[PDB]
Structure formats: C-alpha cells, structure tokens
Design a protein around this ligand. Structure first.
Ligand code: IHP
Ligand code: ZN
Ligand code: ZN
Lengths: 298, 33, 599, 177, 25
C-alpha cells in the first residue's frame, strides 16, 4: 500500500527529526548539520535554515502551518515563519524569518512538542527541567526527561518520558504530576483519543497506557532493536514504529502484528533511524534515518 | 457500481467532517467547565 | 574527387568556423592569454610545461571565469580560447589542440561555459557580439576535437558524448538550448546572436550525440535484427560510394501494397471478383500467376516504418491489455522529447534562415565589421551564407534520418511541419540557379567545393525524404514544374547527386505525360541504370488527388501517436483510478446535538 | 551510540566508516591539521572530506549571517540558474545550497563508495566556491573569521588539504596559515 | 478499484466505530 516515491538526499549528517506540513505538500527535516531544510513535492530542498548552531535534535510545526520551532544541542530554541511553498530556494535572504528565539534550560533540547491551543508549547531538555512556553511565560518542572509531549484530546494533560523506564503524566494549570506508568524510553506519543498513550522502550517493547490510571494494557515486542521513534496517524488507525533495526513498521491500532514493514536505511553507527512522521492531508509517510536519507512513501 | 461507491465515500467524508465539528464543540464545552 | 562523408576533413572544418573578418582576434587571444600566463608563472612556455602545471593553470582559468565584470570575463574567455587552440606545424597544432582540449574537458570547462552561455542568453556589426562569439568558439572547438577523434581518452569521449546529450541543462539537452537561441533570433528579439556559429555548434552536437551516417546504418541494422525483420539487401553507403557519373547495383524491392494491388488485379481478371487486402488466397489463379506471386513475395521488403505503424495502431486498439509499453531513451528519443513542445517554430526558423542564406533577420550581422577589402568582404559573406546552408541542411537531414529510425511517426511529425512551411518550393527555388557554378564556387582563400556540394546533396536527400510514397506531395513536385530544374541539376558529374536527382525524376515521371518520356530518354536511361527498380512498377509506361485531406488524415495519425506517448497525464480519461488511501478523510449546533441524540 | 538524554559530552563518551574515521579524527582535536588530513583511497576521501568541510562551514555561515550587515559587506553567484550577483550573504547561502545539490546529486554521486573520475572535477569547482566565502570572511569580517578559526582551524586545514590534492592554485590562497 | 474502495470503506467504518465507543465514555 505504501511504496517508495522520494528520497530527499540533501542532508550530510543524520536527520534527527522530521515533520509534515498539515495541508501543504511540504516536509521539514532537521538534521545534525545544525541546519534544517524545507522541501516541497530526486527532489531538491526549497529552504535551508541558517540560524541554529550545533546539531538539531527536536522539531515541531505550528499547527496553523506557518511557524516552526526547533531545539537541539545549542540549548536554545528557534522559531521561524516558514516561507510558503513555491518560494525560490536560491532567493534573497530574509532576516525576519527567524522571528522568535527562546532561551531557556541550559541543556540540549531533546524533546519538542506543539500545543493545539496555539499559544503554548512543550520543550524538554537533558537539564531535567521541562518548560511550557508561550510565544515569555514559562512553567517549569524539576522532576531525565527524554520525551515530553502534549496530549491532544485535552490540552490540560501532558506526558513525560524518563530514562528510568516509566513515564509520568501531569497537567497544565496545576503542574502536579498525576501518575507514573511502566530502561531507556526513546519516544512517546499520544493517541488523538484521550486514554491511549503509546511509549517505546529500550527493551524493544512498544507499550500502551491510559491517561486515567496508566494501565499496562499492551506490551508487544516490536523489532530487533530499541524502538527509536513513533508516529501516530492524524486519525488514529495506523502507527509508525521506527526502530534501530533500520526497519520501520506500520502497525494497526487494532491488529498489533506486522501490518506492514518497510526496511530501507543504513546502520551508519550504533544508532539507526531517528524519526518517523505521517502526513495529515495527503497521506505521505516520511522516515528520517541515521545516514541523512529522508525516505518518503506514498 | 464504482461511481455509486464513490458517492458513498463522499457521504462518509461529510459525515466524518461533521463529526469532527461536533466533537470539537463538545470538547470546548467540557473545557469551559 | 568528392568523398561524401558526414563531415569534411578536420582542417577544412576548423577553417570554416572563423570569418575572414575576425582574423585579428587570434592575436588578441594570445596577447590576452600570454599576459595572464606571464603573471601566473614566469620564464616558461605552455608547451615546455608539464601535466600538473597545465591542470593548475586550467583551474586558474576556470576560477577567473566567474568575475562579475563582463570585460574581465571576456579577457579570461579569450585566454581559454587561445588555450583551446594551444598554438608551427599543422600536425603539431592538431596534436596540441587535441591534448589541450581533453585537458579542458578533464578540468571541467564545459559546464562553466554552458552556465556563462545561459547568462549571455538571458540578456548590425561583428563587434556587436564578440563575447558570445568567443564563448561559442570554444564550445564548438571542444565538440569538434572530441568528435574528430570519436572515430586513451576513450572513456573521456564516451562520458562526454553521453552527458552532452543528456538532459542536464534546464532538464533539456544542449541541442535544445541551441534551438532556443535560433528561435529567439528568428523572432527578431535577439538581433545580435552570431548565427553561423550557433548553427555549426548545433550541427556538430546533433552529430556527436546522435551519430553520423555509418552509426545510422549500424543502428538500423540492429533495430532490424531486433524486430526480426530480415537484413537489408545491400550496403547503401558502399553501393553509392562505388557508382559512377553519366550498372544495376540495387536488388529490387517490392512493398506489400504492390503485392496486394497486383493480386487484386489478377483476382478481378481471373476470378470475376476482387477480395480485398488479402495476399495469401491464391488458389484459383493459373500457375503462371502463382509463379509471379511467389517471385514478388520472395522479393518483399518490409521496413521498420510498416511494423512500427502496425504496432501503433495495435496499441491504439487495445490500450490497457498490456499494450502500455516502455520506450528506450536513446539520445534521439530524448532529443525528440525536448523538441516536441515547440517543434514547428524551430522548423520555421530554420527554413527562414535557410531562405535568407540561399544564393539568391539580417543573417550577415556576424561577419560584417579599398576595393580589395570590398572583394574580400564579399567572398566572406558568400562563405558565411554557404556555411549556414551547409549546417542547416545537415541538421535537417540528420534529424530526419534519426527520427525515422527511432520511430516513423516522429519523422512524419517533423516532415509535416517542414512541408507546411513550404520546404518543397523553398528547396526547388534553391535549385533554380546555375547549380554547376554553386558547386564549383571557390569561395575560400587560404573542382568541387566540398562544402557547397555536400549541402546540395543533403538538400536533395531531404527533399526525397519529404516526398516519397505520399501521392499529394509528389503531385506538388509536379505542380511546381520541378522536372526542368532537376534534369538541369543532373549536369553535375557527381554520382550521389545524380542518384538523388533521379530518385525524384523517377517518382514523378509517371505524371509527366508520354510526350515528356518520348522527349527525354537520356534521363530515362539514367533512371534505369542508377535508381533501384521496383517490381511491377510503371514509371516507364505510366498512363496518368486530395492534398489537404490526406494531410489532415496523416496529421490525425501523428497527433494520436504524440498524445499517446507524451501526454500520459491526460491519456485515457475514461479509465482513471480513485485514491482509496486515507488522504481523502481530510481531503450548525443542531448538526451536533441531534446527531448525537440519535441514540 | 548516543541515546537521548545525553547533554553534551556523552556524545564523545561513547558501513562508510570513512566518515566515522573523519569524525573520530575531528573529535580527537580540532587542531591537528595533518593528522585528520592523513588519508586512511584518495578520491572518495576527497569527496567525504569536502562534505565534512561544507558541514563545518555552515557554522561560519551562521556566524557571519549573525552580523553580515551591508555596512561593509564581490564575484557573482552560480547557484541561480542565470548567474546573478546575489551579494555576500546571499552568495554564501546559495553556494552552500548548490554544494549540497552537487554533492548529493544522484547523477554525479549515486554511491559514496565509488565516485567516477568523471565527477572529481566538480570538487575543484566547489572548493573554488568555498574560497570565495573564505576571502569575504578574511577581508570584511576578519575578527569573527579568526574566532571561528580558533574554534576550528578550517582555513589552515583546507589550504593544506588543497596543497595535498591540488584543487586550487597556491596563488589563489591569500589567508596566512 | 472496487476492492480498494471496499477496504477504504472498512477503514472508515472502523474509524467511526472507535470514535463512537470513545464518545460512549
Ligand atoms: O524504409 P526504410 O527502411 O526506412 O529505408 C528508406 C527507403 O526504403 P524504401 O524504399 O522502402 O522506402 C529508401 O531506400 P531505397 O529507396 O533506396 O530502397 C530511402 O532512400 P531514399 O530516401 O533516397 O528514397 C532511404 O534510404 P537512404 O536514406 O539510404 O537513401 C530510407 O532509409 P532510412 O529511412 O533509414 O534513411
Ligand atoms: Zn559579510
Ligand atoms: Zn546565489
């Protein structure tokens, strides 16, 4: 059902993060080159961002589809107004693009998430302090926050992973973590329904919990490597499980077997494919791997 | 039959979109309280 | 005396690029390159240097070639041009040229030159356009030398000749850029382009990226074998090389149409009823008719054109029952994919330039800057026009042959828009002067002027490719009263020119009336000897048309082919898929309340 | 590897190993010019090294764009289809994007294990482009250039590199080593 | 084509079933 159509080969070192535009046929790819590139659909990039220093780790798109937030090694966050599609890649540089700059925790930003309330966003770092931001009001949490994300059904509840092996849920207006649920935990995601929340363990066991009692409802072994990234369908049917086995799998939220398996990526080091991203309007799937090779299947 | 099922698909799309609007409104209502 | 090859000898070619007006340029070139040489390294010469010194200097040249000032860029390009010439002994300068050129290739001069050429594209007298001229010179030289050895560096010429024809420039081959230059000139909205050099470069690049007549014959033989058709009866090139002025060298051929016509005549005469387009039912006819049928069908000649048209109508019959085919991207095919959008304008422009360059849109702008100077300028302008005609004729002929070999309908699509622009009367008018003088025109300062004679042979070959097996166009050949022109051109003692004149006279001798046959016999004797004989042909005793209708039918055939093979987007709108994937899923209070309250 | 949650230094606390070899040599110290420039092949090594060079140069690009004001801020760019004089900052950006295009162009570099010698000529072009950036840096913005060179001796590295492989004239070099 | 439409419809009805179960709570 999903065949390879594009290989966005213009990044040198590993592409850590990637995310699809909501409506446009445009894909944003952040790498360790300290630079990220926007592409519009053997294809060439449409824009490159010359504002971030140090390798980029995490990226999020403004749900309206006009701004992008990034945070990586530089321990800072950048906020650009992405130029619309059909712009010239070889055009006059516009300094206004980097409209926003966020200075927060002194450590590298490992996790970035946008909020559907269009005024806040979650930034977790290696500092151990998750920060909620408003594009200048920041609410911090001093609980190894590997992954921290924004539950969609209620923007009040948010999740937080940990290198321990558990993940804690908390609120927005309370800052009081509700319950933990159960070793490195690479990537956590939240279903577009309130209860279901998916986590990926270092022990290669994709696990599932609920935002009300954190029950270990399901723990299926996924691949032969620590599952690095997870991506959720914009309508909650399938699930991309990117693993260090250079083997991405489309699981089904009902049938938790190998509903589909694609394997195209190189083991450049002990680390393999970083991130996986669905679309939301055009049904494309993109995978950003360790060798800086964004594959796109339609 | 192909054309008929295509129109059925359009119908289901309308239904899903109006479902989206309804659920967004209910979420906003519950969030207000 | 005259040896028809795909191109004159290399020395004549190189001499036939510079006008007798742009002589002093040579001085400048040295006086440019040397000076920069002097500053780069000292007390040495380019010839006494060694390899890595040469490569370093070449990289320095390519570096300097990107200054933003037109004047310094012109200086650097003149230096590169002198390098490409390299200059004592003619063999010495030839070897040094080959060496320097392969060096400039190795460092990668060509792509820099193409970029600078685009730059000059996106913007009377000779000096009106020097830079472009200079630039063009280099490119031509390069291709020339690279192809002059196209018959070590084997990998070099192979990869070059492969990339030159690959769509690497605006996703179009180099020839497309040159065609664009030609069009932009004929449109009068680029009145400074040097046209002799653009045309020469287009000719040489079409040549090297598509292959001359020998590679043409070889590709024809291979495509014959692949399609299962029996091999060709003769070696046409050799047969014509072994003719004389004015034997029966041609093995007779008979196209299927003749077999069917004869068989239906015999059926009407012996069986009392014609059958219709069937050539296997021979049972009731007498034995002396079976003998004739066997003799015919054993001399049959089915060319690639027939089988290709058959496959085309087949595809059009059963589109999606596996009929969808893949087409090889041989350089001719990519060139046609490039030309197809705006072909007719290209053809019209080429013919306009031709007609402006016939012996009797200011084309002479390239060459124009004492009675001796007036005479030299006159012979120079004549030479300019001669070279333009040679280049245009060769381009057209190569394109025609290569398209017909690639797929017949491409040849037809080119020929249709070539004749719509009145190419037949154009060529005939070109032949309505004292041809002998044109051929013996010694319009060059350091017999048969190989340039003019080559061009005339090419024009005849084209005119033949245009009007053959197309009755309306043959009647056109008759209407313009071509015969007294052709059999007057028949005076040239060359053999191939005679052959290609007779190829026309024979095709139109049926419609010329018995009296004409009775009057001209020496020409009929020549037609007997030289031209191939078709069985059951009636040229020697012929007895005896909807032009626009036959055209508008062939046009429909052509456009169907083109739309099928190069409009796969719109092709077959009846049967289209629907994206069953979930891209569609995302592709007033009561409407909530009641719908929820449904249960 | 380097799992997440690893702040800065754990990154060094840990096919195509030529890039991993280059990376190990770089992390060893950003000072040892020759030691990194000591080959382990020669062609594919030039390829990977030019890749790494433009990668590191992105840093100079952002450092300059930070203060590449038109107050004091040459040649013409070529990433544009028709070469236009996109000025210093635009030139730098377009050249970096075009170098990415080339070095990642499929028709010229399908693989990273065997580059045809019909492609190593492009490396001369791209390093010629690099030295324009370097000249603008050394001339208009000497101080930040020196800061970045203290961070990593890029210009020295590349001068020794080119003199090792002879892509550009020594007369083209104007920066002291 | 009809089979693909069938599978898409099955997908959409699974979607609606899950959405309505979620609405139940
Ligand atoms: O049909 P093709 O396989 O394409 O061969 C034809 C053609 O053959 P037909 O007679 O069947 O039309 C002629 O060859 P002959 O008449 O000599 O037998 C023709 O010659 P003219 O154009 O002079 O009439 C020419 O052969 P050539 O180009 O060598 O003259 C040409 O072959 P191409 O189409 O491949 O050029
Ligand atoms: Zn500057
Ligand atoms: Zn530029």
């Amino acid at each position: 059902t999903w065949n390879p159509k594009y290989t966005l080969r213009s990044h040198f070192d590993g592409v850590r993060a990637l995310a699809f535009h909501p409506v446009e046929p445009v894909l944003v790819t952040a790498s360790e080159d300290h630079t990220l590139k926007l592409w519009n659909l053997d294809v060439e990039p449409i824009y490159t961002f010359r504002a971030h220093i140090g390798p980029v780790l995490s990226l999020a798109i403004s749900s309206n589809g006009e701004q992008c937030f990034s945070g990586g090694i530089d321990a800072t966050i950048q906020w650009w107004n992405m130029p619309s599609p059909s712009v010239d890649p070889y055009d006059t540089y516009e300094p206004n693009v980097l409209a926003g700059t966020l200075v927060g925790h002194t450590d590298a930003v490992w996790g970035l998430a946008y909020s559907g309330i269009k005024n806040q966003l979650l930034s977790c770092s290696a500092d151990g302090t998750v920060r909620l931001w408003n594009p200048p009001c920041i609410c911090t949490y001093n609980g190894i926050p590997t992954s921290v994300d924004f539950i969609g059904c209620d923007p009040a509840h948010m999740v937080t992973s940990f290198n321990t092996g558990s993940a804690v849920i908390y609120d927005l207006e309370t800052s009081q973590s509700l319950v933990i649920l159960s070793n490195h935990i690479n990537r956590v995601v939240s279903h577009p329904t309130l209860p279901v929340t998916i986590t990926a363990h270092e022990d290669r066991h994709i696990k599932f919990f609920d935002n009300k009692t954190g029950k270990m409802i399901h723990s299926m072994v996924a691949h032969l490597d620590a599952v690095t990234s997870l991506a959720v369908d914009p309508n909650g049917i399938y699930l991309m499980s990117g693993s260090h086995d250079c083997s991405i799998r489309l699981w089904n939220l009902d049938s938790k077997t190998c509903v589909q398996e694609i394997t195209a990526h190189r083991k450049k080091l002990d680390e393999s494919i970083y991130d996986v991203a669905f679309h939301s309007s055009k049904a494309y799937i993109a995978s950003a791997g360790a060798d800086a090779l964004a594959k796109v299947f339609v | 039959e192909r054309k008929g099922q295509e129109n059925l698909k359009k119908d289901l799309v309308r239904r899903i979109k109006m479902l989206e609007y309804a659920l967004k409104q209910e979420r906003a209502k519950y969030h207000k309280l | 005396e005259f040896e028809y090859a795909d191109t004159d000898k290399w020395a004549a070619e190189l001499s036939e690029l510079y006008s007798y007006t742009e002589g002093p340029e040579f001085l400048m070139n040295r006086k440019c390159f040397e000076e920069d040489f002097r500053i780069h390294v000292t007390d040495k010469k380019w010839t006494e240097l060694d390899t890595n010194q040469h490569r370093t200097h070449a990289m320095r040249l390519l570096d300097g070639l990107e200054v933003t000032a037109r004047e310094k860029r012109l200086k650097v390009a003149r230096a590169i041009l002198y390098v490409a010439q390299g200059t004592s002994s003619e063999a010495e300068v030839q070897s040094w040229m080959r060496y320097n050129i392969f060096l400039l290739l190795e460092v990668g001069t060509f792509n820099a030159l193409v970029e600078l050429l685009n730059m000059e594209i996106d913007n009377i007298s000779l000096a009106d356009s020097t830079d472009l001229r200079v630039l063009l010179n280099i490119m031509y030289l390069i291709v020339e030398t690279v192809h002059q050895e196209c018959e070590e560096w084997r990998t070099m010429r192979q990869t070059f000749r492969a990339e030159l024809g690959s769509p690497l420039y605006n996703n179009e081959p180099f020839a497309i850029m040159l065609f664009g230059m030609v069009t932009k000139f004929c449109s009068g909205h680029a009145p400074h382009f040097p046209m002799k050099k653009v045309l020469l470069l287009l000719w040489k690049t079409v040549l090297c990226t598509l292959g001359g007549f020998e590679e043409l014959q070889s590709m024809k033989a291979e495509k014959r074998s692949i399609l299962g058709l029996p091999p060709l009866p003769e070696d046409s090139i050799k047969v014509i090389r072994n003719m004389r002025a004015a034997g029966l060298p041609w093995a007779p051929k008979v196209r299927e149409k003749d077999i069917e016509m004869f068989l239906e005549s015999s059926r009407s005469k012996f069986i009392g009823y014609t059958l219709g387009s069937d050539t296997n039912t021979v049972v009731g006819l007498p034995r002396p008719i079976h003998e004739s049928i066997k003799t015919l069908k054993q001399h049959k000649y089915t060319s690639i054109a027939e089988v290709q048209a058959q496959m085309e109508e087949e595809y059009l019959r059963s589109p999606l029952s596996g009929g969808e085919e893949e087409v090889e991207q041989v350089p001719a095919e990519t060139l046609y994919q490039g030309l197809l959008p705006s072909l007719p304008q290209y053809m019209i422009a080429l013919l306009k330039i031709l007609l402006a360059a016939a012996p009797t849109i200011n084309i002479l702008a390239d060459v124009l800057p004492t009675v001796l100077q007036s005479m030299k300028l006159g012979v120079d302008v004549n030479r300019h026009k001669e070279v333009i005609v040679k280049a245009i004729s060769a381009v057209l002929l190569l394109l025609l042959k290569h398209f017909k070999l690639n797929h017949v309908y491409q040849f037809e699509y080119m020929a249709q828009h070539l004749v719509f622009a009145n190419c037949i009367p154009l060529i005939l008018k070109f032949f309505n002067q004292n041809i002998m003088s044109y051929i013996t025109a010694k319009n060059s300062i350091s017999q048969f002027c190989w340039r003019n004679l080559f061009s005339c042979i090419n024009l005849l070959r084209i005119l033949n490719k245009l009007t053959k097996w197309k009755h309306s166009r043959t009647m056109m050949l008759v209407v313009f009263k071509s015969a007294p022109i052709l059999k007057r051109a028949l005076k040239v003692k060359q053999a191939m020119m005679q052959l290609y004149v007779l190829k026309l006279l024979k095709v139109q001798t049926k419609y010329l009336g018995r009296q004409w046959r009775k009057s001209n016999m020496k020409t009929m004797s020549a037609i007997y000897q030289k031209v191939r004989h078709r069985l059951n042909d009636d040229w020697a005793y012929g007895n005896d048309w909807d032009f626009q209708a036959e055209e508008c039918a062939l046009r429909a055939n052509i456009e169907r082919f083109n739309a099928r093979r190069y409009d796969r987007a719109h092709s077959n709108p009846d049967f289209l898929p629907v994206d069953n994937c979930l891209q569609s899923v995302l592709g007033f209070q009561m409407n909530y309340d009641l719908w929820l309250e449904r249960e | 590897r380097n799992r997440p949650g690893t702040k800065a230094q754990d990154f060094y606390n840990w096919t195509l190993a030529v890039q991993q070899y280059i990376q190990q040599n770089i992390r060893a110290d950003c000072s040892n010019i020759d030691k990194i420039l000591e080959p382990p092949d020669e062609g594919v090594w030039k390829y990977e090294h030019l890749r790494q060079f433009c990668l590191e140069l992105n840093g100079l690009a952002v450092k300059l764009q930070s203060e590449c004001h038109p107050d004091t801020c040459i040649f013409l760019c070529a990433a544009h289809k028709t070469p236009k004089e996109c000025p210093a900052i635009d030139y730098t950006r377009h050249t970096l994007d075009g170098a990415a295009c080339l070095l990642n162009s499929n028709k010229y570099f399908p693989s990273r294990v065997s580059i045809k010698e019909s492609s190593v000529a492009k490396l001369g072009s791209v390093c010629r482009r690099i030295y324009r950036i370097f000249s603008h840096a050394y001339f208009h913005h000497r101080q930040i250039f020196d800061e970045y060179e203290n961070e990593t001796f890029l210009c020295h590295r590349f001068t020794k590199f080119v003199m090792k492989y002879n892509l550009m004239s020594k007369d083209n070099l104007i920066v002291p080593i």
